[PDB]
Design a protein around this nucleic acid. Structure first.
Length: 105
RNA sequence: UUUUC
């Protein structure tokens, strides 16, 4: 997919997914487009330090990946995934107040 | 943990 993910259009930033709390030491922009492509058709993807971004054809595909990968385990570390335009409550270094393990036991 | 020498 394309390396572009920073579009600010009133639909392109809602068809985007923010992937915070990412390990980034074992996952790259050539892997996110193979792990998030199962929840929607990716039209762009980028990875950074501690976070990544994925761009879909529409917001529906973003809701499927935010609900399909948030709290999944990558590189042995849980991810914190959310829409790129509707952040939950917190972002920096934290964003979960649950057991973060209720899906593994 | 909000964006690509």
């Amino acid at each position: 997919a394309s390396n572009v993910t920073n579009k600010t259009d009133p639909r392109s930033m809602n068809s985007r997914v923010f992937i915070g709390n990412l390990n980034t030491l074992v996952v790259k922009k050539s892997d996110v487009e193979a792990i998030f492509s199962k929840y929607g058709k990716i039209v762009g993807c980028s990875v950074h330090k501690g976070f990544a971004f994925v761009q879909y054809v529409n917001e529906r595909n973003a809701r499927a990946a935010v609900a399909g990968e948030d709290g999944r385990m990558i590189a042995g570390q849980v991810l914190d995934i959310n829409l790129a335009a509707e952040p939950k409550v917190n972002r920096g270094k934290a964003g979960v107040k649950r057991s973060a393990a209720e899906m593994y036991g």
